Write a protein that binds this ligand. Structure first.
Ligand SMILES: Cc1cc2c(cc1C)N(C[C@H](O)[C@H](O)[C@H](O)COP(=O)(O)OP(=O)(O)OC[C@H]1O[C@@H](n3cnc4c(N)ncnc43)[C@H](O)[C@@H]1O)c1[nH]c(=O)[nH]c(=O)c1N2
Ligand SMILES: Cc1cc2c(cc1C)N(C[C@H](O)[C@H](O)[C@H](O)COP(=O)(O)OP(=O)(O)OC[C@H]1O[C@@H](n3cnc4c(N)ncnc43)[C@H](O)[C@@H]1O)c1[nH]c(=O)[nH]c(=O)c1N2
Ligand SMILES: O=c1ccn([C@@H]2O[C@H](COP(=O)(O)OP(=O)(O)O)[C@@H](O)[C@H]2O)c(=O)[nH]1
Ligand SMILES: O=c1ccn([C@@H]2O[C@H](COP(=O)(O)OP(=O)(O)O)[C@@H](O)[C@H]2O)c(=O)[nH]1
Lengths: 513, 517
C-alpha cells in the first residue's frame, strides 16, 4: 500500500546538516523534498537554551568560522542586517601552573615556569631530531603527539587534556583527524619566542569569527529554517521518525504518518538510525562506534565583567583542579546573552557555596560563564554533584572570587556529545556508510557520519548540501571523504545563487539575441 | 548595437574539451549555449587522417584509458555496439643497445646488457640511499630523475629520451607533472627481477585500453558530436573565431557573424586567445609559455605482420639512430586502419630508398607504422627531409628490412603539440587563468590551460565538463587544479544520467498521471 506522503528526497532531522540539505534542495527547486524533525524548533545540537532568569546558553558555547562561501551566503540571507552580528577576535588561553598560557599552548612555552620550559624544549629537540629521520607514519594519536610535541609537552598538557575532553586515553585514538585541530610546533619558532618573550596566538581557523547578536547560535538556525517553505517542513511530535523501512523505502512517524522516498538524507545519530531500520547487521556495526557524553554547565554572575576575565573568549583546563576541560565567557559574545542591568534578580548563592549576603532582587549588570564536562564509560561523573563541582572548579582556577554572587545556574546532559575518533572508527564506518548508500540512504552529520574532523556547524551544514548535490548533480562529496582537502582551501565555488538560477531567470524575461 | 546571436554559454573549439563542455550543457539543458569550431570535422588534435591509399593515421596513435565514469558513459552512448570497440593489453618496449626492454624501462634493467645493468643499479643504490634521508623537494625535472633513478638510468635513457620528445633539456622542466607519468623504481623490486630475470610491465594507467573499431580516435569524437543538437553547432569556416571582445563580451567569426555570451569556455591555444583579445598584457604573459611542435609520420608497408613485430603496441626510441622518439604499430589496433588484403596497391619504394622491383598494383595484406618527431626552438627539424629520415630510422632500428615494400607515406606538422612543463609555467598560468576568469572566460584544454599532467583526451574532456558544472552548478574544478587528486582516485560521482534528469523525468511522469486521469 502507498504511503500517506511521497517525495523524491526525504531529509530527517533539522540541525545544521538537515537544513543544509534543505537549503540546497530549495535552491535547486527540482526534485520534490520534505524535511522532518522531532523538535518543534530547528537547530538541533546548535540550539540555545534560556534560564528562568534570562541567561542564554549554547550547547557548550559555539563559534562560527567558515571554510565555505555557501555557508556564509545562507547566514547573510537569514540575518542580512549588519547589526544582526558581532565580530570578535579569538582570545584563547590555557590554564597551566596557575598561569594563562596563550593558545596554542605548544607555541607559547615562553609563558611557563623556566623549570617547565626546559622540560618542553628538551622534548621538542628529541622529537625534532627523530622526525628529521622518520619515514613511517604514527599509528595512534599518542605516537603523533610524542613525535610532534615531544614527551615534555605531552605529559604537561596534551595527554592529560585529551583524556579530559575525549573521555578516552590518547593511545586509543587515531591521528588522521587532527589536520587543522592540533598545531604541530616548529622548533625554530618556539625557541625564538622563549628567547624574545613574545606570543603566538594567530594559529588556527578560529583567529577571527562572528557571533549572532540575538538568540545565540540557535537564533541563526531558526532564521535559516524561516527561509524555507513551511509546507515542506514538519517539526515537533508530528515529525518524529519511529520506523525506517529501507527495503520498501518508507518512513513512519510518531503519529503513524508514513512517508515515501526515493532518496533519504538522514542526519540522526547513525546508531539510532540502525535501530529504526531494525537491521541486525548495521546494529552490530554501529555499536563498534564510541562516543562521549557532554554536560553543559551555565553560571550567571552579577557585577560588571571582572578585569581578570577581560576580553577572554574560551579557555582550556588540562589540570585536575576542576571537572570541566573548557570554559567560555559567554557574556562577551553578545550583550543579549544575559539580561540587562535594570533587570532585578535575587542572588541564589555565592561562589564558595555559602548563602549570599542578601537575597533581595538586586540589579545587574550581569555576566555569564559556560563550561563543558565530558563523560564516558571510561570516565564517569556524578550527575547530582557536578553542578557544585564546577562552581568549585571555577573558584580553584580563579575564575570566580568566593564572594561572587551567582544569580543563575544551568545544567544539561547531552547523551551524544562527541563522535570519538577511535582506532576502530574507520574500519567500522567504511562498512556502515557505503552499505547505507546501497539502500539509497545518505547518513550525514556530526553523528550521521560520525567524523569529528568535519563535525562542526559549517562542516555539518555542507555535509547536507553536498549530499543533495551528489544526489541531484553528481557532485563529489569532498567534505565527507576528504576532510584535509576542504579544510586546507577556500571553498568559494558553490554559492546560494549559482548560474542555474541566474540563467533560468533571464530565460523568464528572456528574448534577445 | 547587439550581436547577431546571443547565448548564455559559448564554447570555442570542438576538440575533446569543447565536446566535453557541450555534452554537459546538453545534459543539463538549462542555459542556452552554442559551440563553434573552425574545422568542419569535430575532434581537434584527436582526429584522424586518411592516405589516398587508404591508411588511417591518428595524431600520435592515441590510446583510450579513462579516470572518469562520465567519460566512459559518453563514449558508450557514442559507440554503443560492442563490435565498435577493440580492447588491447599494453605491449610496450623501449629500444636500447639493440634490445627490446619492456616498459617501464626503469623496472626492467634485467633485459639490458650486464655492463649497463651495473651502471643502472649503482645509481639506484646511491639514489635510494639519498632518498632515505631527503627532506627537501626536487626543483627541476632533472633533479627528480637523479633522485628517483640515479645517474645510471638518467644518463642511459631518461635524459636523452626526454629531450628527444620534449625538445627541451630535463634541467629546464619542472617536476610536479609526473605523478602517474614517470614510474619511480623500487630498489628491492628492481634487484629481485635482475636476479630472477623477470619482467614487470603492469605499471601505469596504460596496462589495458580500448580502441575504436572504425575511424580511429577521430571516429569517437565524430560519434560523440552526433549526439549533440546540430543547430547548436557551427563547424567550419563559418565557425572560425577571429576576434574576442572581452569588454562587451562578444566574439567575431570569419564570416563576420558576432556572438554575444554571458560565459565563455575557450579551448583554443591560450596564446592565440590573447592575440584574438588584442590584450597586450595577456599576450606578454602567454609568450612566457613554451611548447613543442609535433610531426606525425605514417608508413604503409606490404606483407603479413612480421614476427619480429608481434603484438607490440608502441615503442620508445631514446637512442640517436632515429629521429623519432616513439612509434606505434597502428595496424595492430584495428583491422580497419589499413586497406584489406585484397585491395591492390603499387609499391612506392623499398625501405632502403631504392625503386621497387615491380610497379604493378599487387595485393596485401598490409600493416602500418606511426612515428612521432618533436620540434622546437632548441631542436629544429628539416621538414623536407624528415620523412626519408624516419624511414631510414625504421631500417636502423630493425623495424623494416631494407627490402620491405612501402605502399603509403604520410606526414603532418602540428604547430602546437605538447604544452611544455617548464619551470616558468605556473608563474605564468597563475596569472593568465585567474585574469581570464575575471572576464568570465574559462580557458581550458591541452593548450587552453596548458597543463600536460592533465592533457589527454579524458582529462581534456572532463576539463570541459567541470568548467560547465562550475559555471552552472557551482562545482569545484578538480581536474584543472588538483591533477593528483583526480588521477589517484575513481571518479564515479558525475554520470551522463544524474539525479536531476531522473527527477525531472519522474515529475513529468506525475504530470502525465493527471493529464488524462
Ligand atoms: C559541546 C559541543 C561543542 C561544539 C559543537 C558540538 C558540541 C556538542 N559544535 C558542533 C555542532 O553542535 C554540530 O556540528 C551540529 O550541531 C551537528 O548537526 P547535525 O545536524 O549533524 O546534528 P544535530 O544533532 O545537530 O541534529 C540532529 C537533529 O535531528 C533530529 N532528530 C533526531 N532523531 C530524529 C527523529 N527520529 N526524528 C526527527 N528528528 C530527529 C534532532 O532532534 C535534531 O533536530 C560546534 N560547532 C561549531 O562550529 N563550533 C564549535 O565551537 C562547536 N562546539
Ligand atoms: C602527439 C599527441 C599524442 C597524444 C595526445 C596528443 C598529442 C599531441 N593525446 C592528448 C590529446 O590529443 C588531447 O588532450 C586533446 O586532443 C586536447 O583537446 P583540446 O580540446 O584540448 O584541444 P584540441 O586542439 O584538441 O582542440 C581544440 C579545437 O579548437 C579549435 N580551434 C582553434 N582555434 C579556433 C578558432 N579560432 N575558432 C574555432 N575553433 C578553433 C581547433 O581547431 C579544434 O577544433 C593523447 N590522448 C590520450 O588520452 N591518449 C594518448 O595516447 C594521447 N597521445
Ligand atoms: O591549547 C590547545 C588546546 C587544544 N588542543 C588540541 O586541539 C584539539 C581541538 O581543540 P578545539 O577547541 O578546536 O576542539 P573543540 O572542542 O572546540 O571542537 C583538542 O582535541 C586538543 O587536542 C591543542 O593542541 N592545544
Ligand atoms: O619507459 C619509459 C617511458 C616513458 N617514460 C616517461 O614517461 C613520460 C610520459 O611518457 P608517455 O608515453 O606516457 O607520454 P605520452 O606521450 O603518451 O603522453 C615521458 O616523458 C618519460 O619521462 C619513462 O619514465 N619510462
Amino acid at each position: 500500500t502507498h504511503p500517506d506522503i511521497s517525495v523524491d528526497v526525504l531529509v530527517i532531522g533539522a540541525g545544521p546538516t538537515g537544513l543544509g540539505a534543505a537549503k540546497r534542495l530549495n535552491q535547486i527547486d527540482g526534485p520534490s523534498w520534505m524535511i522532518v524533525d522531532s523538535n518543534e524548533t530547528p537547530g538541533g545540537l546548535a540550539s540555545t537554551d534560556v534560564t528562568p532568569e534570562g541567561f542564554l546558553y549554547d550547547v557548550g558555547g559555539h563559534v562560527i568560522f567558515s571554510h565555505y562561501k555557501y555557508f556564509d551566503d545562507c547566514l547573510d540571507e537569514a540575518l542580512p542586517k549588519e547589526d544582526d552580528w558581532y565580530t570578535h577576535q579569538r582570545i584563547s588561553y590555557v590554564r597551566c601552573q596557575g598561569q594563562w598560557v596563550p593558545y596554542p599552548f605548544q607555541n607559547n612555552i615562553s609563558m611557563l615556569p623556566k623549570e617547565e620550559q626546559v622540560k618542553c624544549i628538551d622534548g621538542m629537540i628529541d622529537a625534532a631530531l627523530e622526525a628529521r629521520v622518520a619515514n613511517t607514519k604514527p599509528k595512534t594519536f599518542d605516537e603523533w603527539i610524542v613525535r610532534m610535541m615531544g614527551t615534555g609537552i605531552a605529559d604537561l598538557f596534551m595527554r592529560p587534556y585529551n583524556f579530559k575532553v575525549w573521555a578516552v586515553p590518547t593511545t586509543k585514538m587515531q591521528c588522521a583527524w587532527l589536520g587543522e585541530k592540533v598545531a604541530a610546533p616548529n622548533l625554530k619558532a618556539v625557541t625564538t619566542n622563549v628567547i624574545l618573550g613574545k606570543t603566538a596566538g594567530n594559529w588556527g581557523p578560529n583567529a577571527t569569527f562572528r557571533f549572532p547578536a540575538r538568540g545565540g547560535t540557535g537564533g541563526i538556525w531558526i532564521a535559516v529554517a524561516n527561509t524555507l517553505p513551511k509546507e515542506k517542513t514538519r517539526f515537533g511530535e508530528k515529525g518524529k521518525v519511529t520506523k525506517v523501512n529501507a527495503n520498501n523505502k518508507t518512513v513512519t512517524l510518531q503519529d503513524g504518518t508514513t512517508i515515501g522516498y526515493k532518496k533519504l538524507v538522514s542526519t540522526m545519530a547513525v546508531d539510532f538510525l540502525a535501530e529504526a531500520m531494525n537491521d541486525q547487521e548495521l546494529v552490530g556495526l554501529t555499536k563498534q562506534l564510541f562516543y562521549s557524553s557532554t554536560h553543559v554547565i551555565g553560571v550567571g554572575v552579577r557585577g560588571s565583567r571582572p578585569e581578570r576575565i577581560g576580553d577572554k573568549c574560551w579557555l582550556y583546563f588540562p589540570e585536575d583542579n576542576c571537572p570541566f576541560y573548557r570554559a567560555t565567557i559567554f557574556s562577551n559574545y553578545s550583550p543579549y546573552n544575559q539580561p540587562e542591568a535594570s533587570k532585578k534578580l535575587p542572588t541564589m548563592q555565592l561562589a564558595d557555596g555559602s548563602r549570599p549576603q542578601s537575597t533581595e532582587a538586586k540589579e545587574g549588570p550581569y555576566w555569564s560563564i559556560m563550561l563543558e564536562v565530558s563523560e564516558s564509560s571510561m570516565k564517569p561523573v556524578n550527575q547530582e554533584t557536578i553542578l557544585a563541582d564546577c562552581i568549585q572548579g571555577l573558584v580553584n582556577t580563579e575564575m570566580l572570587k568566593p564572594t561572587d554572587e551567582i544569580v543563575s545556574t544551568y545544567h544539561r546532559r547531552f547523551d551524544h556529545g562527541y563522535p570519538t575518533p577511535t582506532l576502530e572508527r574507520e574500519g567500522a564506518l567504511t562498512q556502515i556508510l557505503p552499505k547505507l548508500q546501497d539502500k539509497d540512504i545518505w547518513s550525514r552529520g556530526r553523528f550521521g557520519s560520525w567524523r569529528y574532523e568535519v563535525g562542526n556547524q559549517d562542516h555539518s551544514f555542507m555535509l547536507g548540501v553536498e549530499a543533495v548535490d551528489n544526489i541531484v548533480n553528481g557532485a563529489v562529496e569532498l567534505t565527507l571523504n576528504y576532510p584535509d582537502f576542504v579544510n586546507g582551501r577556500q571553498n568559494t565555488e558553490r554559492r546560494l545563487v549559482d548560474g542555474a538560477q541566474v540563467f533560468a531567470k533571464s530565460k523568464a524575461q528572456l528574448e534577445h539575441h
